[PDB]
């Protein structure tokens, strides 16, 4: 049909060619006989007939006369549907500026004219004149005149010059300007400029003028002289049920425009005084502005409610505009809704659908099969049969729903498992019966939740429901490869109770012929489910081939584990059930079944697990009583002891031994300790207090307490909640967040009193208000992520890149937060993985690291694997299937046509409602030590002194992999020789946290340089030290001289010889900053390593990381590598000069010195190391360290937020969003290219342009990749439709109109807007043969 959408400015002739007549009157319809009035806003002569195939006068009344325009009424005899398509126009009596091109910032009229919006608005409002042309006059072009200046220069310099006011003046200025001449003038002005602010000004204006030259647009079309009128059926005036009329606000706004325009024409006919005509022109301008965008300029016009009228711009923008309410999502037919209940009998692929719902949802199918089977002669006979609900329409309904899936949806659809397809089973209720195992995917409970049903109509939709969306395809999560159709609550409690063992249970110690004998003995009441017993078990294993070989042996098992073995599929080991099965063990059992045997055994296994767990949770009788909340018998004395401690601390505070701060902190500490004591006593009295007799002798076993069994199986409940049931509730926080110093010593088994309950509600309401207010923030973040990543699709199979990220385990301090195996599983290697035994290929170059390769990496010592990433994919407009890796929902490599961007955005945004809206080194374990980035010297006391700020300590095991990683401050003295064994708890590093020491260069003697005493020093004596110290104070502390001039502590030999560096002849001196305390004099020897001077020192976070927000005061990084020097101080901006050795030397910054610097004048810096400290800005990380550094930073900083709440997301999904944030590139040197310098282009565009330029031997452009947040990256897309539908619709449509953009509909949103197959999924083939039957 069409292949692109173009947007541009409309000329007056274009606007008159859309129209079918001029709207000349504000009449809508006759009040007596509601036919539309001629020449009005509803006019059948302009806009089309109001009855289908009938004129207005009734003279031509049938399709016999079609297309004939009546000569009496002028109405064309045609369909009335044309009243939705036929526009009109208003010929404006005065030129009126378009408010979008004036007032949507930056102003296009202002930027094109290079006038301030203050001067343009003064001319528009008839307050000032502007000189269109100066002539033989001293007046420059566009010079603004007040009225008196105009009347002076008019009589003084005659009518040689031309000066006007109003939008006729602005229009004459926009018409009189030469765009190409001004482009050349501005370009040669750019070639004369070094000021980067003015250079940005000029490149903005140049690309505006160039967009106007390249487009067909003319500047003067930004001033309206003709006004389009929307078709009247899109602004309908319709009679309501009670005879009242309902209208659009556009009729009010259009009527006001017509009324002020007709009065302006009248006044120009009467030759009114010009104060009246200027007023009418201002009123027509503000009426047209209110029609186009109501509320931008001035106060919003309200009509008859004091509610502002909805303008044309409000129709298409916002959450309730066309795009977001009607185009990006719709209300659909063949859709129902009901409360969901549980069906525990259902199979995983089926739902229960009420017969009353299905009879309506499937109604044309039933009509078709009633007429087809001869049971109805006519669709109306069939309709009456279905109304009467004859007994045969239920048979017809049972055969029309037979293999026909339905989609079930629960809002909010946070991820794609919120829509799943099921085969319906017709039930008799009114409630949908949902399978239990899918509820966790839906986040559904049966406490009043509703779900929507949708009927797939076409064969393709039915086969996508069956093949893509069916719940038996959805057992693995797409966020992480973990099972998402997983047992819970009742199932895991039944499977846990079944697989537990009692000590002296009935039937203990017999020997069973198999699991069938165990079931016989349990059912006949001769053995207990927990009787530990000896069963002959035959288990099958897969050999090297796909063959399944059996082994039979007597296992020491229980009766219930033998019973549970009967439902386990064959390729699985008996050790998978020979344990008590909690939630984790059952999830791992399902994952094991999936990886070993595949999907068909796994869905059968999951159904059998559900049935068995339900059955044996029923058999258990597992109740909850009040005697199950066993309160520890020593809780009262723990509380009495903490009360005695708090009383003695209170008496200490009365006796002045402690101030209120440490007093309060001591009370908080002795109550947190007593709470931990009560919790440990409660859990110890709860977890094993089955004491049981084995042949007379008492023995302890794990407890069959019901509260404990629910908590221990992972069914429901944490230890933190058993603490509130049976322990004490503990310390509560004020709404301030500060802890109330008297805790709830009660639990819920005992009562809380009124005061305890009140201070518990303090935090209960805070949590509930967080839940209520963070869904909006998480939805907004997910929407921004989808709209930044929607266009990313796996388009290629392999891009042949060799880049990638080096995956290592995440180690923060001395904990391994993320192992290598789950950071590298399902990813394609980027280089051959080698053993510690060198040059032997362990894993070849393009291997997808499935579980066997990961076990091979784990049994070897591989600590780092370089893998392929989407940020390093070479594919233009997409991603190859190898840089992505596995589809985590399938378990194999991703397919071409997968919308991995929507999956990534949903995977990140789904857990957002589980996030919150509001010194020395102690090595843990044994292993070798190695340090990195060390500036190391030997102290006089047998030490290692690491005088650096980039060093880090790493603890290696005998395996060879780093297990702990710390990093130590400047001048941290090492208690260890680096490179050999340490022990657990062994202190390796000690330093000063609160003060920064100065550590010397080489051994020698103190010498002084530029420290003129009395002006750079206060020599102060500390009364109990014996030797006085010398302070180098602030700059305002002393007079001119040493305040800015730096004291330099030289080191020389005692014979006066300056000591020279090993390797360089660099002069050994130490320049120290102000606020320093020195304890040294001249003459005393100092070896290398003496410390001479001491200078003393949730969900919003993820949203800030993806928006790439620069923090409040960032870290300061070294742009270029070199040596530090200092320029103009004593302004407030300390001037740092990094001096390279082989580059262009001067590079300065303006560091405000109210942040402590962490660099010295003698030490070098690498590009990007911290000069000052603070939260790093990701733009700086990208510029100075690169793309891999900023993606490493963003994935680590986002997974720190997610791992803290126990949320497991693959970092494929964060790398997808990071790749979509690195989509632009600013050109630094164009070469022989079509780009300017300092111009932001797409990275793929400049990469393709360089591919073509180095294909023709010429030099391509050089660029610097930008980092944009997810809002600025999704607003900077090459598609104006998706950007305008995301947000800021006015800005997007304004820049797209003045630039003359064209949208080729290449992403998912633009094909959703326009009702096409998306270019992903099963529409990927269609778009491929749409583009190869267009490029041919």
């Amino acid at each position: 049909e069409f292949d692109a959408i173009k947007i541009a400015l409309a000329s007056p002739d274009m606007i008159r060619s859309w129209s079918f007549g001029e709207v000349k009157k504000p009449e809508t319809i006759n009040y007596r006989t509601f036919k539309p009035e001629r020449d009005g806003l509803f006019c059948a002569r302009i806009f089309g007939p109001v009855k289908d195939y009938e004129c207005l006068c009734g003279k031509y009344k049938r399709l016999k006369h079609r297309g004939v325009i009546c000569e009496k009424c002028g109405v064309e005899v045609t369909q009335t549907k044309v009243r939705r398509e036929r526009m009109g126009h208003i010929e404006l009596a005065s030129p009126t500026a378009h408010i979008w091109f004036l007032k949507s910032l930056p102003s296009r009229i202002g930027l094109l004219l290079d006038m301030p919006l203050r001067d343009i608005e003064r001319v528009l409002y008839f307050e000032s004149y502007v000189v269109i042309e100066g002539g033989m006059t001293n007046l420059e072009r566009q010079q603004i005149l007040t009225e008196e200046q105009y009347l002076d220069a008019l009589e003084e310099f005659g009518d040689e010059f031309d000066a006007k006011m109003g939008a006729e003046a602005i229009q004459a200025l926009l018409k009189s300007m030469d765009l190409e001449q001004e482009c050349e003038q501005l370009r040669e002005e750019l070639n004369e400029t070094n000021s980067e602010t003015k250079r940005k000004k000029l490149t903005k204006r140049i690309k505006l003028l160039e967009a106007f030259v390249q487009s067909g647009n003319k500047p003067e079309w930004m001033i309206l002289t003709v006004l389009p009128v929307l078709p009247p059926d899109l602004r309908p005036l319709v009679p309501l049920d009670g005879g009242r009329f309902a209208t659009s606000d556009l009729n009010d706004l259009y009527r006001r425009v017509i009324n002020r325009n007709n009065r302006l024409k009248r006044l120009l006919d009467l030759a009114a005084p010009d104060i009246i005509v200027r007023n009418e022109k201002r009123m027509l301008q503000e009426a047209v502005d209110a029609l186009l965008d109501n509320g931008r300029r001035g106060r919003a016009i309200t009509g008859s409610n004091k509610r502002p009228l909805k303008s044309l711009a409000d129709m298409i923008k916002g959450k309730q505009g066309r795009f977001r309410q009607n185009l990006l999502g719709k209300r659909v037919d063949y859709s129902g809704r009901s409360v969901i209940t549980v069906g525990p009998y259902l199979r995983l692929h089926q739902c229960g659908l009420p017969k009353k719902m299905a009879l309506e949802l499937f109604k044309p199918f039933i009509y078709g099969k009633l007429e087809l089977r001869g049971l109805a002669t006519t669709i109306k006979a069939a309709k009456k049969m279905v109304e009467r609900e004859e007994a045969v329409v239920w048979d017809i309904l049972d055969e029309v729903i037979r293999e026909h899936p339905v989609l079930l949806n629960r809002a909010p659809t946070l991820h794609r498992l919120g829509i799943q397809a099921f085969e319906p089973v017709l039930i008799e209720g009114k409630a949908i019966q949902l399978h239990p195992l899918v509820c966790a995917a839906y986040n559904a409970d049966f406490d009043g939740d509703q779900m929507a049903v949708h009927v797939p109509l076409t064969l393709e939709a039915q086969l996508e429901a069956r093949a893509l969306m069916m719940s038996t395809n959805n057992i693995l999560s797409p966020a992480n490869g973990e099972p998402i159709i997983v047992p819970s609550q009742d199932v895991v409690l039944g499977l846990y109770y079944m697989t537990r063992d009692c000590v002296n249970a009935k039937g203990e110690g017999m020997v069973l012929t198999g699991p069938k004998e165990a079931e016989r003995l349990y059912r006949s009441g001769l053995a207990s489910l927990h009787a530990r017993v000896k069963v002959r078990i035959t288990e099958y294993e897969k050999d090297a081939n796909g063959e399944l070989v059996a082994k039979t042996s007597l296992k020491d098992t229980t009766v219930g584990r033998a019973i549970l073995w009967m439902i386990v599929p064959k390729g699985l080991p008996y050790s998978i059930v020979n344990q008590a099965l909690g939630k984790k063990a059952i999830s791992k059992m399902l994952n094991t079944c999936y990886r070993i045997l595949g999907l068909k055994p796994t869905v059968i296994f999951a159904d059998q697990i559900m049935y068995t767990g339900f059955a044996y949770a029923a058999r258990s009788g597992a109740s909850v009583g009040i005697d199950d909340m066993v309160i520890p018998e020593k809780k009262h004395e723990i509380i009495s002891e903490a009360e005695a401690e708090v009383a003695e601390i209170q008496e200490q505070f009365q006796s002045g031994l402690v101030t209120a701060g440490e007093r309060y902190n001591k009370v908080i500490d002795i109550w947190a300790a007593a709470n931990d004591r009560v919790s440990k006593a409660m859990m110890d009295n709860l977890q094993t207090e089955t004491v049981i007799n084995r042949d007379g002798q008492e023995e302890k076993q794990v407890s069959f307490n019901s509260i404990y069994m629910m908590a221990d199986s992972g069914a429901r409940g944490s230890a933190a909640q058993i603490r509130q049931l049976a322990g004490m509730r503990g310390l509560m926080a004020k709404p301030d967040g500060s802890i109330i110093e008297t805790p709830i010593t009660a639990n819920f088994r005992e009562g809380l009193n009124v005061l305890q309950y009140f201070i518990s509600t303090h935090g209960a309401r805070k949590g509930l208000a967080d839940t209520a207010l963070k869904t909006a923030n998480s939805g907004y973040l997910t929407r921004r992520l989808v709209d930044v990543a929607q266009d990313l699709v796996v388009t290629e199979d392999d891009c042949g890149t060799h880049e990638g990220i080096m995956m290592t385990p995440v180690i923060e301090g001395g904990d391994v937060k993320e192992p290598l195996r789950d950071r590298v599983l399902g990813r394609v290697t980027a280089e051959d993985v080698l053993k510690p035994g060198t040059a032997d290929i362990l894993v070849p170059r393009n291997t997808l690291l499935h579980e066997q390769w990961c076990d091979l990496l784990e049994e070897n010592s591989v600590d780092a694997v370089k893998v392929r990433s989407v940020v390093s994919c070479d594919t233009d407009f997409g991603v190859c299937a190898h840089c992505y890796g596995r589809d985590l929902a399938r378990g194999h490599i991703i397919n071409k046509g997968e919308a991995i961007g929507v999956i990534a955005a949903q995977s990140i945004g789904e857990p957002g409602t589980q996030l919150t809206m509001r010194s020395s080194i102690q090595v843990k374990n044994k292993g070798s030590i190695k340090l990195s980035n060390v500036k190391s010297v030997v102290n006089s006391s047998g030490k290692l002194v690491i005088t650096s700020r980039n060093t880090e300590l790493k603890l290696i095991d005998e395996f060879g992999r780093t297990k702990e990683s710390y990093k130590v401050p400047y001048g941290a003295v090492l208690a260890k020789g680096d490179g050999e064994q340490v022990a657990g708890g062994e202190t390796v590093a000690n330093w000063d946290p609160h003060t920064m020491p100065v550590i010397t260069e080489v051994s020698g003697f103190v010498r002084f340089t530029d420290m003129i005493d009395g002006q750079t020093i206060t020599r102060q004596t500390d009364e109990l030290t014996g030797l006085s110290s010398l302070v180098v104070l602030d700059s305002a502390e002393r007079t001119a001289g040493g305040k800015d001039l730096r004291p330099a502590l030289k080191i020389v030999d005692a014979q006066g010889n300056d000591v020279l560096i090993p390797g360089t002849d660099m002069p050994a001196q130490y320049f120290l900053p102000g606020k320093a305390i020195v304890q040294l004099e001249d003459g005393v020897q100092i070896s290398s390593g003496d410390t001479l001077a001491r200078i003393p020192q949730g969900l919003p976070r993820v949203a800030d990381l993806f928006e790439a927000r620069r923090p409040k005061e960032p870290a300061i990084l070294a742009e270029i590598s070199g040596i530090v020097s200092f320029g103009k101080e004593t302004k407030g901006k300390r001037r740092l000069v990094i001096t390279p050795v082989d580059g262009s030397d001067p590079y300065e910054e303006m560091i405000p010195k109210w942040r402590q610097l962490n660099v010295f004048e003698g030490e070098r810096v690498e590009r990007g190391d911290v000069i000052s400290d603070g939260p790093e800005a990701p733009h700086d990380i990208l510029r100075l360290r690169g793309v891999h550094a900023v993606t490493r930073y963003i994935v680590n900083e986002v997974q720190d937020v997610y791992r803290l709440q126990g949320v497991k997301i693959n970092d494929k999904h964060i790398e997808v969003i990071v790749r979509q944030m690195l989509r632009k590139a600013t050109i630094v040197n164009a070469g022989s290219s079509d780009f300017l310098e300092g111009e932001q282009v797409e990275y793929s565009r400049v990469k393709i342009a360089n591919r073509e330029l180095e294909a023709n031997g010429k030099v391509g452009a050089t660029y610097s990749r930008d980092l944009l947040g997810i809002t600025k990256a999704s607003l900077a897309t090459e598609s104006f439709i998706s950007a305008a539908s995301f947000q800021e619709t006015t800005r997007v449509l304004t820049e797209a109109a003045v630039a003359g953009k064209r949208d080729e509909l290449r992403g998912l949103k633009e094909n959703v807007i326009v009702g096409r197959l998306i270019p992903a999924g099963t529409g990927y083939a269609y778009h491929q043969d749409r583009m190869r039957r267009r490029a041919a």
């Binding site: 199979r347 999924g1321 099963t1322």
Partner: protein, 79 residues
């Protein structure tokens, strides 16, 4: 009937291509006069198409050679 579609995805190596092949064959059976190549055990044409795909009787190349055979046969069978 059809519970899991995994066996048909192995033959037609994509889930996205499987839907297209199966919908082409299911439309041949539904509105064309084509009879199933498998015993129709009270299945709908979508499930019959999936059961033919999972038996190797239908793929995109088989559907292509079948339509080319029918097209050349019926364009040749007139004077």
């Amino acid at each position: 009937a059809r519970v899991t579609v995994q066996d048909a995805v192995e033959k037609i190596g994509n889930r996205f291509d499987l839907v297209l092949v199966a919908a082409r064959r299911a439309r041949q059976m539904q509105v064309g006069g084509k009879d199933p190549l498998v015993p129709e055990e009270n299945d709908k044409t979508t499930v019959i198409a999936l059961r033919e795909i999972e038996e190797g009787l239908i793929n995109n190349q088989i559907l292509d050679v079948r339509e080319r055979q029918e097209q050349q046969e019926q364009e040749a069978a007139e004077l």
